[PDB]
Structure formats: C-alpha cells, structure tokens
C-alpha cells in the first residue's frame, strides 16, 4: 500500500515540494 496510497499520503509533502529534488 505504498504505491498509490502512502506514496501520495506520506510523500504528498515532497511530491508538491521536492519529490526527487
């Protein structure tokens, strides 16, 4: 559950800020 669930729930901060950067 860490592909589309936690990936956008616990990474939303990075995805919107510095996903890979």
From Swiss-Prot:
Post-translational modification summary for this protein: Phosphorylated by FAM20C in the extracellular medium.
Chain positions covered by the region annotation Glycosaminoglycan-binding site: 1-21
Tissue expression: Expressed predominantly in liver. Also present in plasma.
Phenotypic consequence of residue 13 to M: Reduced heparin- and no dermatan sulfate-activated inhibition
Known role: Thrombin inhibitor activated by the glycosaminoglycans, heparin or dermatan sulfate. In the presence of the latter, HC-II becomes the predominant thrombin inhibitor in place of antithrombin III (AT-III). Also inhibits chymotrypsin, but in a glycosaminoglycan-independent manner.
Domain notes: The N-terminal acidic repeat region mediates, in part, the glycosaminoglycan-accelerated thrombin inhibition.
UniProt record similarity statement: Belongs to the serpin family.
Disease (UniProt): Thrombophilia due to heparin cofactor 2 deficiency: A hemostatic disorder characterized by a tendency to recurrent thrombosis.
Protein name in UniProt: Heparin cofactor 2
Species assigned in the record: Homo sapiens
Residues of the full protein shown: 192 to 212 of 499
């Amino acid at each position: 559950k860490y592909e589309i669930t936690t990936i956008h729930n616990l990474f939303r901060k990075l995805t919107h800020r510095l996903f890979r950067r």
